[PDB]
Structure formats: structure tokens, C-alpha cells
């Protein structure tokens, strides 16, 4: 009843959770493993492309 | 830094994974194996072309996100 | 003053008025000729109390995808319809007498009360922008906040009954949509779509020769595939009926359509046999269509849209909220039932949707000019003329409200729109101080429409993730990238 | 947290499958 006569903003703060983790986890769960290993090839070939 | 043996390793791992795959997963992995064989026969030219396409997409994406250059 | 200034051009205005009437007649002839052969029959439906018609865009707002018309010509059509509405005070002398000229003087005083013919400008875009910046933005900037309050107080209810009416999952989205003028942060449209959680599940019953079947994403996908294959009708109808019987079996396994167990709607069971008509244990009398075998299941071509808007429906809005919704959109509102204002709002909705379609045909938003985009956003009621935004912010705003209007719900549309008309005035001269940061800029990429967003839990809001940070975003955003880089 | 540990676990499971496969392959090659 005395909510107006308090300062409870510290008792209720916005969480520091990154929602991106929930997104990337759903991304890996849907993909297979050989595509995960392929991404290491896509990155490596991109490095050699920038090198040449 | 070698690329051909890494692609061979990827193809062999995909073949190993194909055994435990379901029907749709089996079809997708078969298409992937055909893609890898096409890369192998093309001497990594199609692979580098696809890499360049994706990198061009990314490199067009970056400068547009600079709202305050 | 403006009275004599407009009387000076009143002779020169009648010719333009009649020319505009002829243009309107020709365009309406074309549009109705197309509509009478390509558009379905949206039947009239009465409200729950069954005294006045009710209107929804899903059934009544049809979009002629394939209208061979330029966007500017449609703007002319709509603006001249509004000019015909504004020509109504000319009837005052013909119903009151020769002393019915003082209303005509009041009409000629303000230029915002007048049609296009009294304007010195020529292009429809410049004329529309002049009218807006002179009269319409000011008229709209004094209805926005009050309309927002009415929408809020429609959700939360009156007399301290929020614990009985509001939902605890739409709470943070409600706050971000309605109280972001406190924070100064931008809003996500998906948080306004979360307001639809107050409503039920919107369904679509296709009527067959046997029973109604609920439409699903799978059945619609199959029908679109069959439509794209361009098959013969002997094969098209066969595949459609195959998908239809499949969906019928699927819903019969689900436990019937969603509508059977929703308060206010329902499918009757088999009729009862009364008294001696009861033949022992068979207390029912099935319908005629029970004789038809299920393999002959064919779509009647008839559809029933059920929005299930238990809190959002325009009937329960009221005498005042409807009028303010029409005021805020610069539509006619006085001395009419809420049914007529509902139709006016739905017609505005249809106009905006057709304009969106024509814009997409013309090459999107980027093909438009700056004044044309400004005028489009003014028509959508998301910009006020005292802002001077950038082009990217305008494009993002257009994309936002276009997606929001694609959902066919006026309440969330108005909730979104009214947020852009909450401006304050300071009592001091020094304050607000001159800012140090640059003007607000955005892009079409910053708007997340291609992803779903769950409602944030009450008092646990989450930060905003850019679409670019998602995996494979460069592939999903490739269209916008190609449009922007070019 | 309850979102970072899950992501780390999924990544570790993927790397585990990869490393186990290639280790078995190396062992068979030595055999
Ligand atoms: C004086 C003598 C003058 C004689 C003049 C005669 C010649 C001049 C004109 C000729 C008449 C032509 C025919 C005509 O005009 O039809 C009009 C009108 C429309 O007919 P329609 O086109 O077939 O309507 C079809 C649909 O309604 C179409 O739907 P819609 O969406 O297009 O519009 C629907 C909207 C109608 O939309 C409009 O027409 C807009 C009207 C504003 C413009 C004017 O709603 C209605 O249909 C009204 C129905 C009335 C019942 C609804 C409940 C009303 C509640 C009233 C307030 C509460 C009462 C007090 C409560 C306290 C007691 C408990 O017909 C009427 O029903 C007229 C009724 C007018 C009196 C209503 C008074 C209600 C309050 C009475 C209190 C108790 C005392 C009485 C006992
Ligand atoms: C019955 C209703 C059935 C249809 C309802 C639709 C409708 O009536 O539209 C009116 C319509 C309401 O506006 P709206 O449809 O919501 O659209 C507004 C725009 O969006 C623009 O909105 P805005 O925010 O820019 O505001 C424009 C501004 C400026 O509006 C103007 O365009 C110029 C002002 C013209 C004033 C005309 C009224 C003259 C009143 C008589 C004065 C004495 C005459 C001389 C001595 C005799 O509005 C005003 O300042 C006042 C407008 C309302 C004046 C009252 C009109 C009476 C309508 C009759 C039905 C209601 C009584 C039942 O009035 C007008 O704005 C145009 C003038 C209408 C002249 C109609 C002449 C027939 C009058 C019949 C008298 C019946 C008396 C019966 C009871 C006694
Ligand atoms: C007394 C307190 C003031 C009276 C004001 C009442 C307003 C009357 C009215 O507007 O009727 C239409 C009004 C509905 O009109 P509406 O379609 O919602 O549009 C509102 C006006 O257009 C909104 O007006 P506006 O924004 O269009 O401004 C124009 C208006 C503004 O001018 C005036 O209405 C009055 C002029 C003097 C004030 C000027 C100050 C500036 O003048 C007019 O041309 C039309 C007025 C007639 O009727 C009602 O809402 C019902 C209220 C009256 C019934 C209350 C109960 C009566 C007693 C029952 C006795 C038997 C029971 C058993
Ligand atoms: C003057 C200008 C006339 C032009 C029409 C006015 C504006 C258009 C309009 O009112 O829409 C028509 C209105 C439709 O309202 P709506 O837009 O559909 O809003 C419904 C929402 O759900 C409702 O949403 P809401 O909840 O936000 O608004 C509710 C509002 C809704 O109310 C209204 O609709 C007010 C509308 C303003 C009307 C202007 C009145 C101005 C009077 C001065 C011509 C008629 C010729 C025939 C006359 C003889 C019947 O208030 C009420 O519900 C209460 C209404 C009744 C108040 C008076 C009650 C007196 C009680 C006396 C004690 C009785 C004790 C005996 C008990 C016996 C034992 C049981 O329907 C009608 O009133 C009948 C239509 C045809 C005649 C209309 C004009 C005369 C009757 C009024």
C-alpha cells in the first residue's frame, strides 16, 4: 500500500542476460556438425582470399 | 595452409554422419556430398566463388550499419 | 484575410472542381470494373447486439494486386475523394436558404477546410504536403495523446480494475509502446504486435459441402504451391480437395476446429429428435451432407474469417474512441454511428494497403522522393511536420507501419501511430538545451520484422538484438542490402 | 546464467563429435 513512499528500483533491476545466447544456441541445435566444420573452411578460405 | 585435405576430411566426416541420418537429413547430406564433389572436381573455383559472394554480401552489409560515420 | 483571398479564386476553382469530379468518376469506373470481377463478396455483418454493421479489414479491405495504375494517380483518387467530402458545405444554402451562406464563408476562411481547387500548387504531393503542414498535422497533434490514453484505458479498463482485465505478459511491451516518450528509446513493432495477446486466435473456416475446415499454414502453403504450378483445373481442384480432406482429418484428430470451444462462437452438433421422433438410441438427426462420402469433399469457395478479438474489436471501442481514431487519421467523424466510422477507417486502411502494394511495384520506398515519402508517412500518421527526420528513419518508419498494417488490426496500428505525437513544451526558455549528439539516423536494416520476438516477462525486460547480429543475417538481409547499396 | 552454459555445452558437444571422429580415424590409420 505504501509503494509510492519507497524506492525499490534496486530490488528490481533489468537482467544482464544476453538474448543472443538463446539465439545462437537454437542455431547450433538446428544445424548439423558437418556444416559447423564447413564454417571453419569458409573462414579459412576467406583468410587466404584476403591474403592473395 | 592446405584446403583440399580439409575438404576431404569434411567429406569423410559427412559420409560417417550419413549412417545415423534420417530420411530428410540423408537427402540433405547427399546433396552436400554432391556439392563437395563438385568443389573437388572444380579445383576449388566454385568454392572460392561462393566464398566471394558471401564475403561481398557481408562487405556490403557493414558500411550500411554505420549510422553515424 | 483568407476569406477574400479564397473568394478571389472561387471562380477559377469551379472548373477545377468539375474536372476533378470527372477524373474521380473515370478512376472509380476503372477500379470498380476491376473489383466487380476480381474481388470477392465481403458480406455485411452486424455487431454482437445486432443493430449496426461491423467492419474489419481482413474481409472488407481488398487489395488489387495487379492494378495497372501509377501511385500518383491513386493518390489523386484518394485526395479527390477527400475533396468531395470537403465540398459538402455547398449544400448548406440549398437546405437552409440564402442565409446559409455564412457557413460557406466559414468554409472559405480556412484553407484546410477546402478542397484542392483552392490551392495554388499543382502537384498532388506538394498540395497534400501544404495541406498537412498548414492544418492537418496540427489537428492530428492534438488528438494523438488523448487517443493513446483512450486506447490504454480501453485495455486496462476503468475504475481500478486492471488486475481483472490486463495481462501480466503484455506488461513490458505495453510499457515500451505507451511509455517510451518517458525513456526516449525507440520502439520495436513486434512489441505492439504483442498487444494482440489480449485477443484470441484468429481463424479462417473454409466452407465445404460437408463441414467447415480450419485453415492452417500447411494447407495454405500447399494451395500456394498448387497455384504456382499452374496446373489444369482437373488437377488443380483434385490437389486442392486432397489437401482439404487431409486438413479435415488433421483437425478431426486435433479435436475439431478452435471455434467449437470459444465463447461467442460455436458449431452446432447434430440436431436432436424430440419425443416420439427419437428412434430408440439414435437421439440425433444428422444433416444431409452426412450422406455425401468424404472423398467428394470440395471447397464451396466460401470463407469465414473469425478474428476472435475479445478486447480489440472495434464494436467494444465506444462512441468516443472511434471518433478519436477517425480524427487522428483526419477522417470524417461527426454525427454518425460507429459503424459508419468503422467503414471509413477500413476504407482508409484499404487505401493505405493498395498504396503500399503500388509502392512495392514501383521499386520500394527508395524509389520515392523525399517529399513523397514524407507525405506517405503523413498519410500513415507516423510523422509530424515539426521533426525533420532523415531518409533512413523515414524508410524504417514506413517499413514498421507497413508490416503492422499487414496484420489487419486497427488498435495496434493506432497504438503505434500515437507514439509519434507525444511532444511536450518546457516552461523555461533555456531548457531544453541544444543537443550535442547528431540527428537520429536509422536504416531499413535496423527494423526487425523477419524474426519473432517472445513477450518479455513482467519487470524482466531484455535488451534489443540487432538483426545483423543474428546468424546468416547477410543472407536474409541481402534484398535490403541490394536495395540500399544501389 | 542459463544461456551461456548451454551454448558452451552445444559447442563442446560438436567439437567432441569432431575430435572423436578424427581420433578414431587416426587410430584406424595407424592400425
Ligand atoms: C418526427 C417525424 C419526422 C418524420 C420523418 C419521416 C420522413 C423523413 C425521413 C424518412 C425516413 C426514411 C427511413 C429512415 O430514415 O430510416 C432510418 C433508420 C435506418 O434504417 P436502415 O437503413 O434500414 O438501417 C439498416 C441498418 O441499421 C444499417 O446499419 P448501419 O451500419 O448503416 O447504421 C446502423 C445504425 C444507424 O445508423 C444511422 O442511421 C446513423 C443515424 C445518425 C444520422 C441521422 O444503427 C441503427 O440501425 C439504429 C437502429 C435503432 C436501434 C439501435 C439502438 C438505438 C439506441 C438509442 C439510444 C438509447 C435510447 C434511450 C435508452 C434509454 C431507454 C432504456 O431506420 C430506423 O430505424 C429509424 C429509427 C429512428 C429512431 C431511433 C430512436 C431510438 C431511441 C428511441 C427511444 C424510445 C422512444 C421511441 C419509443
Ligand atoms: C444527420 C447526419 C447524417 C450524416 C452525418 C454526416 C454529416 O452530417 O456530416 C456533417 C459534417 C461533419 O464533418 P465530418 O463529416 O465529420 O468531416 C469533417 C472533416 O474531416 C474535417 O474535419 P475538421 O476537423 O477539419 O472540421 C471541419 C470544420 C469545418 O467544417 C466545414 O466544412 C465548414 C463548416 C460548415 C458548417 C455547416 C453547418 C451549418 C449549420 C447551420 C448554421 C446556420 C445556417 C444559416 C441560418 C439558417 O467543422 C466544423 O467546424 C463544424 C462542422 C459541423 C457543423 C454541423 C454540421 C451539421 C450536420 C447536420 C447533421 C447533424 C445534426 C443532426 O459537417 C461538415 O463538416 C461539413 C458541413 C455539413 C453541411 C451539411 C448540410 C446539411 C445540414 C443538415 C442539418 C440537420 C439538422 C438536424 C437537427 C436540427
Ligand atoms: C449543456 C452542455 C453543453 C451542451 C453540448 C451538447 C452537445 C450536443 C451535440 O453535440 O449533439 C450531438 C452529440 C453527438 O454528436 P457526435 O457525432 O458525437 O459529434 C460531436 C460534435 O460534432 C462535437 O462538436 P464539434 O467538435 O463538431 O464542434 C461544433 C459544435 C460546437 O458547438 C456547439 O456544439 C455548441 C456551441 C456553443 C459552444 C461554443 C464554444 C466555442 O457546433 C456544431 O456545429 C454542432 C453542435 C450542435 O450528441 C451527444 O453526444 C449526446 C449528448 C446530449 C444528450 C445528453 C442528454 C440530453 C438530456 C436528455 C433529456 C431526455 C432524457 C429522458
Ligand atoms: C443531435 C445530432 C443527431 C445526429 C445523430 C447523433 C450522432 C449519431 C449517433 O448518435 O449514432 C446513432 C446511435 C448509434 O450509436 P453508436 O455509434 O452505434 O454507439 C454504440 C456504442 O456501442 C456505444 O458506445 P459508448 O458506450 O461509448 O456510448 C454509449 C452512449 C450511446 O448513446 C448514444 O447513442 C447517444 C448518441 C447521441 C444522440 C444525440 C441525442 C441528442 C439529443 C439532443 C430522428 C429521430 C426521430 C424519432 C424520435 C423519437 C424516437 O450512451 C448510452 O449508452 C446512453 C444513451 C441513452 C442516454 C439517454 C437516456 C435517457 C434515460 C431516460 C430515463 C428513461 C426511464 C424509463 C425507463 C423505462 C423502463 C425500462 O444510435 C441511435 O441513437 C439511433 C440511431 C437513429 C437515430 C439517431 C438520432 C436520434 C436518437 C439519438
Short mmCIF file of C-alpha atoms in Angstrom, two decimals, chain A residues 46, chain B residues 51-67, chain C residues 443 445 468 473-475 477-486:
data_model
loop_
_atom_site.label_atom_id
_atom_site.label_comp_id
_atom_site.label_asym_id
_atom_site.label_seq_id
_atom_site.Cartn_x
_atom_site.Cartn_y
_atom_site.Cartn_z
CA UNK A 46 38.30 -16.19 -46.64
CA UNK B 51 33.10 -17.53 -50.59
CA UNK B 52 33.50 -14.31 -52.58
CA UNK B 53 29.72 -14.00 -52.89
CA UNK B 54 29.18 -14.36 -49.15
CA UNK B 55 32.07 -12.01 -48.37
CA UNK B 56 30.63 -9.45 -50.79
CA UNK B 57 27.27 -9.70 -49.05
CA UNK B 58 28.96 -9.11 -45.69
CA UNK B 59 31.14 -6.28 -47.03
CA UNK B 60 28.04 -4.57 -48.41
CA UNK B 61 26.28 -5.10 -45.08
CA UNK B 62 28.92 -3.45 -42.87
CA UNK B 63 29.02 0.13 -44.23
CA UNK B 64 25.23 0.48 -44.17
CA UNK B 65 25.11 -0.16 -40.41
CA UNK B 66 27.38 2.85 -39.77
CA UNK B 67 24.51 5.19 -38.95
CA UNK C 443 18.10 2.20 -41.84
CA UNK C 445 18.19 -3.00 -41.77
CA UNK C 468 22.60 -8.08 -38.24
CA UNK C 473 21.85 -12.26 -41.48
CA UNK C 474 23.86 -11.22 -44.55
CA UNK C 475 21.84 -13.83 -46.46
CA UNK C 477 19.17 -9.02 -45.42
CA UNK C 478 20.57 -9.43 -48.94
CA UNK C 479 17.50 -7.86 -50.57
CA UNK C 480 17.66 -4.76 -48.37
CA UNK C 481 21.42 -4.64 -48.92
CA UNK C 482 20.98 -4.71 -52.70
CA UNK C 483 18.31 -2.02 -52.49
CA UNK C 484 20.37 0.27 -50.25
CA UNK C 485 23.83 -0.10 -51.79
CA UNK C 486 22.29 0.70 -55.18
#
